[PDB]
Enzyme design. Structure first.
Site, PDB file in Angstrom:
ATOM      1  N   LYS B  62     100.105  34.611 -73.359  1.00 22.00           N
ATOM      2  CA  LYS B  62      98.687  33.668 -73.486  1.00 22.00           C
ATOM      3  C   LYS B  62      99.145  32.279 -74.113  1.00 22.00           C
ATOM      4  CE  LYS B  62      95.129  36.808 -72.897  1.00 22.00           C
ATOM      5  NZ  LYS B  62      96.213  37.995 -72.712  1.00 22.00           N
ATOM      6  N   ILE B  66     101.734  23.303 -78.022  1.00 19.14           N
ATOM      7  CA  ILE B  66     102.121  21.846 -77.561  1.00 19.14           C
ATOM      8  C   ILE B  66     103.338  22.161 -76.815  1.00 19.14           C
ATOM      9  CG2 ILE B  66     101.206  21.022 -79.664  1.00 19.14           C
ATOM     10  CD1 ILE B  66     104.399  20.524 -80.642  1.00 19.14           C
ATOM     11  N   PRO B 179      87.012  48.149 -59.974  1.00 22.00           N
ATOM     12  CA  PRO B 179      88.201  47.751 -58.894  1.00 22.00           C
ATOM     13  C   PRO B 179      88.051  47.244 -57.547  1.00 22.00           C
ATOM     14  CG  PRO B 179      88.483  50.055 -60.146  1.00 22.00           C
ATOM     15  CD  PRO B 179      87.185  49.498 -60.547  1.00 22.00           C
TER      16      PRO B 179
HETATM   17  N1  LIG Z   1      96.052  38.881 -69.035  1.00 25.69           N
HETATM   18  C1  LIG Z   1      95.286  39.125 -69.712  1.00 25.69           C
HETATM   19  C2  LIG Z   1      93.918  38.935 -70.375  1.00 25.69           C
HETATM   20  C3  LIG Z   1      93.091  38.077 -70.059  1.00 25.69           C
HETATM   21  C4  LIG Z   1      91.530  38.276 -70.132  1.00 25.69           C
HETATM   22  O1  LIG Z   1      90.759  37.342 -69.591  1.00 25.69           O
HETATM   23  N2  LIG Z   1      91.213  39.563 -70.462  1.00 25.69           N
HETATM   24  C5  LIG Z   1      91.885  40.396 -70.637  1.00 25.69           C
HETATM   25  O2  LIG Z   1      91.501  41.504 -71.041  1.00 25.69           O
HETATM   26  N3  LIG Z   1      93.464  40.014 -71.050  1.00 25.69           N
HETATM   27  C6  LIG Z   1      94.224  41.283 -71.249  1.00 25.69           C
HETATM   28  O3  LIG Z   1      94.376  42.231 -70.208  1.00 25.69           O
HETATM   29  C7  LIG Z   1      94.432  43.601 -70.820  1.00 25.69           C
HETATM   30  C8  LIG Z   1      92.990  44.248 -70.633  1.00 25.69           C
HETATM   31  O4  LIG Z   1      93.226  45.548 -70.889  1.00 25.69           O
HETATM   32  P1  LIG Z   1      92.067  46.793 -71.033  1.00 25.69           P
HETATM   33  O5  LIG Z   1      92.170  47.113 -69.333  1.00 25.69           O
HETATM   34  O6  LIG Z   1      90.681  46.031 -71.325  1.00 25.69           O
HETATM   35  O7  LIG Z   1      92.523  47.675 -71.892  1.00 25.69           O
HETATM   36  C9  LIG Z   1      94.687  43.315 -72.073  1.00 25.69           C
HETATM   37  O8  LIG Z   1      96.188  43.241 -72.300  1.00 25.69           O
HETATM   38  C10 LIG Z   1      94.147  41.816 -72.577  1.00 25.69           C
HETATM   39  O9  LIG Z   1      94.901  41.280 -73.513  1.00 25.69           O
HETATM   40  N1  LIG Z   2     100.081  25.069 -86.228  1.00 25.34           N
HETATM   41  C1  LIG Z   2     100.362  24.213 -85.156  1.00 25.34           C
HETATM   42  C2  LIG Z   2     100.346  23.510 -84.120  1.00 25.34           C
HETATM   43  C3  LIG Z   2      98.958  22.719 -83.459  1.00 25.34           C
HETATM   44  C4  LIG Z   2      98.963  21.587 -83.195  1.00 25.34           C
HETATM   45  O1  LIG Z   2      97.796  21.179 -82.688  1.00 25.34           O
HETATM   46  N2  LIG Z   2     100.190  21.006 -82.929  1.00 25.34           N
HETATM   47  C5  LIG Z   2     101.368  21.375 -83.437  1.00 25.34           C
HETATM   48  O2  LIG Z   2     102.467  20.690 -83.251  1.00 25.34           O
HETATM   49  N3  LIG Z   2     101.456  22.734 -83.871  1.00 25.34           N
HETATM   50  C6  LIG Z   2     102.462  23.341 -84.164  1.00 25.34           C
HETATM   51  O3  LIG Z   2     103.153  22.535 -85.676  1.00 25.34           O
HETATM   52  C7  LIG Z   2     104.462  22.320 -85.387  1.00 25.34           C
HETATM   53  C8  LIG Z   2     104.890  20.842 -85.019  1.00 25.34           C
HETATM   54  O4  LIG Z   2     106.121  20.741 -85.447  1.00 25.34           O
HETATM   55  P1  LIG Z   2     106.776  19.054 -85.227  1.00 25.34           P
HETATM   56  O5  LIG Z   2     106.493  18.658 -86.582  1.00 25.34           O
HETATM   57  O6  LIG Z   2     106.174  18.304 -84.132  1.00 25.34           O
HETATM   58  O7  LIG Z   2     108.385  19.438 -84.835  1.00 25.34           O
HETATM   59  C9  LIG Z   2     104.916  23.221 -84.202  1.00 25.34           C
HETATM   60  O8  LIG Z   2     105.192  24.522 -84.742  1.00 25.34           O
HETATM   61  C10 LIG Z   2     103.826  23.241 -83.385  1.00 25.34           C
HETATM   62  O9  LIG Z   2     103.888  24.415 -82.453  1.00 25.34           O
END
Ligand SMILES: N#Cc1cc(=O)[nH]c(=O)n1[C@@H]1O[C@H](COP(=O)(O)O)[C@@H](O)[C@H]1O
Ligand SMILES: N#Cc1cc(=O)[nH]c(=O)n1[C@@H]1O[C@H](COP(=O)(O)O)[C@@H](O)[C@H]1O
Lengths: 215, 215
Positions: B62, B66, B179
């Site tokens: 997921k 950035i 399904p």
């Molecule tokens: N890929 C994905 C993701 C996107 C989303 O919108 N909904 C989900 O449940 N998932 C993932 O699919 C799986 C659904 O599992 P379950 O069949 O509800 O146990 C989980 O790994 C969840 O994190």
């Molecule tokens: N926490 C967070 C997060 C949220 C966001 O909106 N922007 C970011 O850059 N970050 C994180 O902050 C750090 C920014 O690092 P830098 O100073 O741009 O090198 C990175 O770890 C990035 O993943």
């Protein structure tokens, strides 16, 4: 946090990450560890850092799944010793509440990421960010992340969350944000590349703190 | 994917995850591995599964950072042997493009998560989801994820991405999705708890497949 400065430790090598963190440890009190380091070196790096540097660790995992998976990710992350976890607000209130429930169970904290700092945040996140922040307030979130690159947005976010909430802010340095201006609204700034890619990370950190102390 | 069925392996224990995956291997050709398992057992679990089961592995991370951090996450994930990675579209086109660039360099695939399956998706993601899908089309994304729990939304997403795009869909079973109805629009369904929490996971997988075969 010490000196209002959080190191974003996104090097992907344990030796380089340990070296830089040790070099700047006199200037910070909290290290943000994310997936670049964790996926390269393992979750055990969190407890290693916490132990060797005596720092607080924020796990920047941008948690952004369904409630059931969020609960599992948060449990694994706190079991690994993280003090706090960063969670996206955009998946909605049930996903945030799942992280809050696990943080309550484990005596830890959740930071809610509202608006992000990079240009693409303007497409979808920015338009929802005020509402994400208000959702946080309604859920009792006390810790927030918002963007150094848009201080007018950081101001609006501060307005929504109030003065009692804690607000940290990335995008300082490399992405164009300024420490002083960001600290008008945020409690602490996050800095990654400007420190960890510097020829002398300690000198880079010190330069930032000098500019902070002046405010 | 074999039988149009992808196992969401979100057990947190290596021994339980290996047991269940082995028991259902005759009925699937792809396993979705996410942070519950990886953060508990390490990234090496991806190559272990690939080797032991000869299955394709989708890393459900997921990705939602950035662009610079996304490329780091994608590089670590493909280095670990994943065939594909799931990336959020909500953070915008530059963050998605960063993942596509690394996938191109490493000869792997990106799946774009458009609308999520859980109730909270209605708050912010659903209103952006058609535009996130269109953004994917514009960026040349060919693989997408959308929700079994809302087949009318899955229909609309299929409409946007066209028939040539590959669409997988979670939310079957535990979250309420069906399904057969989901496979009207998606190419494959993702199933986690309905199989991995079953008293007999092989029997649960077989039951699902029997219902798929009839379509
Ligand atoms: N890929 C994905 C993701 C996107 C989303 O919108 N909904 C989900 O449940 N998932 C993932 O699919 C799986 C659904 O599992 P379950 O069949 O509800 O146990 C989980 O790994 C969840 O994190
Ligand atoms: N926490 C967070 C997060 C949220 C966001 O909106 N922007 C970011 O850059 N970050 C994180 O902050 C750090 C920014 O690092 P830098 O100073 O741009 O090198 C990175 O770890 C990035 O993943």
């Amino acid at each position: 946090v010490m000196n209002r400065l959080i190191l974003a430790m996104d090097l992907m090598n344990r030796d380089d990450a340990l070296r830089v963190t040790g070099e700047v440890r006199e200037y910070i009190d909290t290290v943000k560890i994310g997936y670049p380091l964790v996926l390269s070196e393992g979750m055990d790096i969190i407890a290693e850092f916490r132990k060797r540097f005596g720092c607080r660790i924020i796990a920047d995992f941008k948690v952004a799944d369904i409630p059931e998976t969020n609960e599992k990710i948060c449990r694994a992350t706190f079991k690994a010793g993280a003090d706090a976890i960063i969670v996206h607000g955009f998946p909605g209130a049930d996903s945030v509440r799942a992280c809050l429930n696990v943080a309550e169970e484990m005596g830890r904290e959740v930071f809610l990421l509202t608006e992000m700092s990079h240009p693409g945040a303007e497409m979808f996140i920015q338009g929802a960010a005020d509402e994400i922040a208000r959702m946080g307030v309604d859920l009792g979130v006390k810790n927030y992340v918002g963007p150094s690159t848009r201080p007018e947005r950081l101001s609006r976010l501060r307005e929504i969350i109030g003065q009692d909430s804690f607000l940290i802010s990335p995008g300082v340095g490399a992405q164009g944000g300024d420490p002083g201006e960001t600290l008008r609204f945020a409690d602490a700034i996050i800095v990654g590349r400007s420190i960890y890619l510097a020829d002398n990370p300690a000198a880079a950190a010190a330069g930032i703190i000098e500019s902070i102390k002046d405010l």
